[PDB]
Amino acid sequence: SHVKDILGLINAFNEVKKITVDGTTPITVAHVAALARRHDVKVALEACRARVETCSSWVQRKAEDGADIYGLQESLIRCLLAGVFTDELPATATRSAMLLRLNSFTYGCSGIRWEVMEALEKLLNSNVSPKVPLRGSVSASGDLIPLAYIAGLLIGKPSVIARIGDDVEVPAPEALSRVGLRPFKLQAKEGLALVAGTSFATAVASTVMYDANVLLLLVETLCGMFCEVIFGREEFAHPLIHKVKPHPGQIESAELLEWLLRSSPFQELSREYYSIDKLKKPKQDRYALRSSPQWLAPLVQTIRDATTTVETEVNSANDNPIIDHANDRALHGANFQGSAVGFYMDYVRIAVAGLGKLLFAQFTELMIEYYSNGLPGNLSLGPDLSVDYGLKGLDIAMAAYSSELQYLANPVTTHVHSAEQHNQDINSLALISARKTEEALDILKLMIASHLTAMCQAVDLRQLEEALVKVVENVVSTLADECGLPNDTKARLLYVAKAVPVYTYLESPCDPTLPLLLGLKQSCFDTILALHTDTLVDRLAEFEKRLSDRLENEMTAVRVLYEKVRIQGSKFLPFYRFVREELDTGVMSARREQTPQEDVQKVFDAIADGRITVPLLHCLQGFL
Amino acid sequence: SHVKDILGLINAFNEVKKITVDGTTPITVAHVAALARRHDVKVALEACRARVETCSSWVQRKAEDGADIYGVELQESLIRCLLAGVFTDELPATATRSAMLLRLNSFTYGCSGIRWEVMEALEKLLNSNVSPKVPLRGSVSASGDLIPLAYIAGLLIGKPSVIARIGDDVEVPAPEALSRVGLRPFKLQAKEGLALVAGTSFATAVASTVMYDANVLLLLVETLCGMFCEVIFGREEFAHPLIHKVKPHPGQIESAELLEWLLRSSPFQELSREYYSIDKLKKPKQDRYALRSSPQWLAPLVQTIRDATTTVETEVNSANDNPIIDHANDRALHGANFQGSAVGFYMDYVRIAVAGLGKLLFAQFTELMIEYYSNGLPGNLSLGPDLSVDYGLKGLDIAMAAYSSELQYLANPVTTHVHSAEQHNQDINSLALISARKTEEALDILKLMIASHLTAMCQAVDLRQLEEALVKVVENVVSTLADECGLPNDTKARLLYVAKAVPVYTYLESPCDPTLPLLLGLKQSCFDTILALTDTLVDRLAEFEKRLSDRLENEMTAVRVLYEKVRIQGSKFLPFYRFVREELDTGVMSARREQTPQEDVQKVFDAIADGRITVPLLHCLQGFL
Amino acid sequence: SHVKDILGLINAFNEVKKITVDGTTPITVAHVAALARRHDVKVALEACRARVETCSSWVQRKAEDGADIYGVTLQESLIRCLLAGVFTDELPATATRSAMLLRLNSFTYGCSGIRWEVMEALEKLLNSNVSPKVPLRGSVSASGDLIPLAYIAGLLIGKPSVIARIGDDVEVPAPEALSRVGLRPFKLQAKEGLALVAGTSFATAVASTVMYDANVLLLLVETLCGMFCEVIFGREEFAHPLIHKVKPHPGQIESAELLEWLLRSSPFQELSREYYSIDKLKKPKQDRYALRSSPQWLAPLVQTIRDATTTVETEVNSANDNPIIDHANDRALHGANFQGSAVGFYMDYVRIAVAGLGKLLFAQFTELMIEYYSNGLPGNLSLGPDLSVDYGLKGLDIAMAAYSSELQYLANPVTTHVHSAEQHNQDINSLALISARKTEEALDILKLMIASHLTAMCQAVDLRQLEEALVKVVENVVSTLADECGLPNDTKARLLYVAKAVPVYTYLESPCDPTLPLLLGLKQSCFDTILALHTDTLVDRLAEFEKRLSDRLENEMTAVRVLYEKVRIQGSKFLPFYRFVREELDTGVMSARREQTPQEDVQKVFDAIADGRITVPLLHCLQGFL
């Protein structure tokens, strides 16, 4: 299952202490992302040093012997320092690019001197990186302009500014000086080896793919939480449905969901709900839940396949010419053409838009009383709704997020211009595409943060609902006895207490126009008819007036007590405990001062910085 | 002509000191951009005080009467629920202050029911450079820009969680920020929460600075087509008013008019004519489309940007909340003026027009870089002479492809992605703010493209003038050596024609190389002159060749070094050349000039971004009527 | 108002008999669509002839004395290399004939140097219904619509490989077609190849019929917003002049002005006001955005479609070949009028606005289908009464999502995809014909959406009229039965309130089902009256009221409905539409008892939209508006 592969990705990301750069051990997107995000992760270049020097020698002798092989170093770098600071590629991306550039050389096809590789290693471990303009690459003879800034650092160009950690910016030659390095004087083919690769596009695409797997698994998992809160029928995940339409991502997501929902205490509440007034409620869930596995299928497959493609690129020699020193020939091709990454970046951006639309459809259902099976509009607790608009602000923002996300998912690869004196008449635009997919993942993080917040709100509201119906049942039950109503009447009255959704009358429970009093009034009239008397009327008028003696006070009490349980038996407990306890939040209401921003910011940040993987792994403990 | 309207917008942007906010004087996009970009510009709210208070009183009396009018603590629960954005990024100070201005102006029509006091507070926060930190995303611009506008409202009521900027340095919680400029948190009354948040002010704000930039950069692109004509050796006839008289799109007529005027009696057009007189049958009789069809291309782009400005300014000058209080006839009118659709649709159109400007620039740049298309210019605009270590503007060329590709992608529509939002109440919604942001991003790229193009054309100006001086040196050396060696009058004329005809950039790298076009051209003539007419003729022709390779390279080198250490002086585009070269302190690009292309183009880009580029533009255009 | 301008366009389309091609009288998009769609309309080329010949002879003079002028001083080799299309699909005869008109018209300015005799042959081919079969693709509309226009030239010179249509079935090689209409193949003179192939006539032809339809459908959509207001129980206040005065986008003012006028004396707005006065506090105080913000939404759409109309007409009335022959001053001028960019960009914009029109329609239709949003109407506009076998307009609802989705997809721009073309000579090119074609496909879909929307609203009128009648029956049955059982005034007034208040479509399926809202509300009031008047006698009479209700009430609801199946619309400005759809097209309220499928009903409406008949009830509806 892709579920276990993604868990393995998350574990490797968390665990790794050293990245082995050796020309043989694959670097994964978890490693790239760990190097980028955890500064205690260090690069360890292993002395492959043999084939690197052989290659280097072959090129360096074909220069002393003055052979003539096509593919002065500073003039290439000078013409490529052609970006403009409007915005810039971040340090995480630049350091990622440095690693991929370093790695590309280990295969001994590039001809760069080993010491330059050592210099890359040192700069990475020292947190030194050049400041690199955002735009300029068409990713075809490589990410020429942006990679030119890394080469510019290595030769100590004064106009290239370098970061050292988060606070220090110094000109290139001073940055080299501070790490015990001297400017390089570039040798034959070395300018081309540094600039003509796919390392920047592939860097962005690596952090993008790592993020895509994590958010994918997170969205898939949270479909189970959605089922629980919406009162879904878990049967949509039944293995047979998916065995007869056997898209691997359809089987595998359904598999996880069947497992997440199997012994669910909310599924138990769902069953009791559809048993009451059975033939007046929907027989099936709406599509955002019920067809989630079918929806997820191509998205899982796209994100998994793109990961393979990007990792192949991470582990490639991607400059030109390729030096076949063994056979004494320089090979003229175009491994710097980033099309594998470019095309898949367009595809993943479409899959991410599809994940966003799934979230938006689910969130929409949750906000609307007609579609939420008992939950209040906007997940508003009230009880006073005139001053509690609940999650309406987050609802509007989810439309804002989905709309921009769908716009972002138009392709970049369809916009190929005939470039560089028509030499690059096809070019991948991989870095541009990767940037747009990254931007699309930023918006999906917002949507996840919002969706999880809303579901924790719904958990609270479902737990509060169950306790409120119990209060009502007890108040009706005991008052019925005290007024001396017959058992016919008592049971009829109790059915109403059970059946009427509590959020439809919580605002003013004893309001004669609201659904509780309406149901009791019709039951009182049917009792009079079934039993016919003047005494029965006395006790029924007594029952009704004595409703506003106790009911409201007891509903308020059990509520206020909740503000100051089924989730404990649910596989999503870790998520709820993380958002409520660890992040320090509570059921949203007019009485809680925190804005939706404050609550959702906490969840968003935990998604951003990877803390959310903790409750996620917890939740999936034992899944095989 | 749109040319004078844009010049009017630029003059207004530079001159304005105070923006009059009174409910009758129009705010234009130039006013919005000046408030945003020049802090010396202050807000002047004029005591319209009468109509605002009347409306405020109506609303308040109707609530105090306990009357039941819909949309008229209730107010603070609205703000609370809308403080719902997330910091990932933010709308910048310039957009937020722009919005604050637009929000203030909308109240001045007295339809909103906000108190005058709150308005005075807005005025003072503006002039005191105070503005809330606002999350980038969350608005669908339909019941207004509810989320981002809530942050302005949050500041006004002293919400502790709303962070506020004071200048570029200071950041403090909203209550403290109100304190520091002598204000107290407001307690909001009937309809005031809704008046503050339910507007189109953020999208319209971004769209105002977007439209200002679109106007300036449009005029800049049109004008620079004239510069392109000069350096590329174009035929100015493409601009002849008769061509456009019979295909009369106003933008076509007006762009052609500007171009005819810029190119009339151009000293560069004189070199162009000379050039096409030598080897006429071997050279194109018409320019390529990126020059020759420029007025036809510009026409819809001009009209789109002009019409969009009008639509955006209409929005700037609107009451855009709900209900609209008709205090005079005692009704709250229920509509949807907060629906930002006019701005949203036009932002999509303007983004397509901006993409069209980018494609025009890309195509022109491409021609200029390629020797086959540049009518004598060296590939990549490399001076060399040694091309093995000078790749000229090849990096800028690649980047222009990168810029255009992303520009074209950005130009897909946002308005086609309407979701059924807010419990299906907002089943249509404009997405204006999102569209405005994308068009803004598209203009960022256009600026990069304009900066590169201008830098490249200044390079080509230098290369054209150098070319003229180089060819005259080659003629003079050929003439004086033909005399010295005692060559026949026929031989002399035939050799001097070759010196005139051969493009000098085809042999600059090694002028006396026998395999390069000058020597090939002279060798053909030499054989021809021998046929028309002996051993002593061969003798003098070998002496010619010999003495050529003693003298020619040195005199070429000398005149080049002198240039490095003129027709542009009579060009309408001198202000641009003088600006880039002198004011910005640059020179002809080559291996000998240490500064990178980044350093040069950056200077140009910054001058476009900060407005300095308008100075040479206005100078260039002086007298055009 | 743009409304008058569009009404002018429709009147012109209808009443034009001859198109004056003279080089001074403007051809409008109505004239182009008239020519394409009404074969009785003839071209009248009015001898203009003098300048054509002056230009012609100037070109021929230079050919004689051997002057040398680029682009003028061969043709059959140009035509040959441009006959490079492939039949996969073709440009329709209507597009080709429109292109022939525009090419003819372009020549009338005397700037092209084409022979008057070639012009007369164009007129004759037009009036005789001859046109070449033209492949669909190949134009980038930059040095003109070169490939498709080559097929017009190929017809004129009698290229055998060029197949010509004559009317709807007849297809003959070009020599045969010319011979059937009394013409002979031309031998092209200097500059005539270019005159013919190097123009913008194809893109601008598709764009002309595109703009005529955009104008008509726009007005139709605007008008039907009022009909939507009527059937959905909207508040007409959204259209009030002061709202739009303070946000004065010209299209916002004018759309709302139209709507205020359509709704001013509405008998449906009267039912609406009455509806909101019952349970005022439980029902929404404002309409949803697809109605309430329709003026703000329509504003940019109105303005796009009108400005785009101007641009396309400017192009219809242009000389758009090259070089531009300035015979007066003995010069050929070298430019690029064949660059179709004015039309290309505006086609992209109009496609987006059409998508915005479709989205407006989709959101309206959506509200209409959902009982939560439709203020009394049944889900899916199902009449029933048995809803288990009547799913109503659910098919059309699904279809509307499909329509809107494909439409939004089509509205991406074409002009952002400019390639460097023709040996990099055409390094900018307009792609105008491609864009026009996509905007045309977008309009095809909008037509589908309008057809469905109008059909749904006619269904809703019927349901609303039945609703008023049904509630009256219920009130009467309750009022009479209260009397027959001697119920007190307290009881009678509570019971009659429930009869007026409960939406009839929530219980129509089984009016006496005790779990449905009529009986629920009746039981509630009965308990309330037993308490208020507090007895064994009252209970006796309330039980007899209930038993008599389930004997008589349903029978009388069925009778009134069965009668309806075998009024407020009569006072409504939308009567012409309703009358058009029900009587003229011969349709009826939709249900399980009506045999015709939703397909058969909507086809009829769509066909009337597609062939222009829908403009009759449209023009009738708008009579009086100034």
Curated annotation (Swiss-Prot), chain C:
Binding site residues for (E)-cinnamate: A198, Q286, R292, N322, K394, E422, N425
Keywords from the UniProt entry: Alkaloid metabolism, Cytoplasm, Isomerase, Lyase, Phenylalanine catabolism, Phenylpropanoid metabolism, Taxol biosynthesis
Coiled-coil stretches: none
A GO molecular-function descriptor: phenylalanine ammonia-lyase activity
Residues annotated with 2,3-didehydroalanine (Ser) modification: S143
Subcellular location: Cytoplasm
Substitution effect: N322X: Abolishes enzyme activity
CDD domains (UniProt xref): PAL-HAL
Documented applications: Could be used for the stereoselective biosynthesis of beta-amino acids via amination of cinnamic acid derivatives.
Crosslink feature (5-imidazolinone (Ala-Gly)) location: A142-G144
InterPro entries: Aromatic_Lyase (IPR001106), Fumarase/histidase_N (IPR024083), L-Aspartase-like (IPR008948), Phe/His_NH3-lyase_AS (IPR022313), Phe_NH3-lyase (IPR005922), Phe_NH3-lyase_shielding_dom_sf (IPR023144), Taxol_Phe_23mut (IPR031008)
Modifications the protein undergoes after translation, according to the UniProt entry: Contains an active site 4-methylidene-imidazol-5-one (MIO), which is formed autocatalytically by cyclization and dehydration of residues Ala-Ser-Gly.
Pfam families: Lyase_aromatic
Activity response to pH changes: Optimum pH is 7.5-8.0.
Catalytic residues, chain numbering: Y70 (proton donor/acceptor)
NCBIfam families reported in the protein's UniProt record: phe_am_lyase, taxol_Phe_23mut
Function summary: Phenylalanine aminomutase that catalyzes the rearrangement of L-phenylalanine to R-beta-phenylalanine. Catalyzes the first committed step in the biosynthesis of the side chain of the alkaloid taxol (paclitaxel), a widely-used compound with antitumor activity. Also has low phenylalanine ammonia-lyase activity and can catalyze the amination of trans-cinnamate.
Family of this protein: Belongs to the PAL/histidase family.
SUBUNIT field: Homodimer. Homotetramer, dimer of dimers.
Protein name: Phenylalanine aminomutase (L-beta-phenylalanine forming)
Organism listed in the record: Taxus chinensis
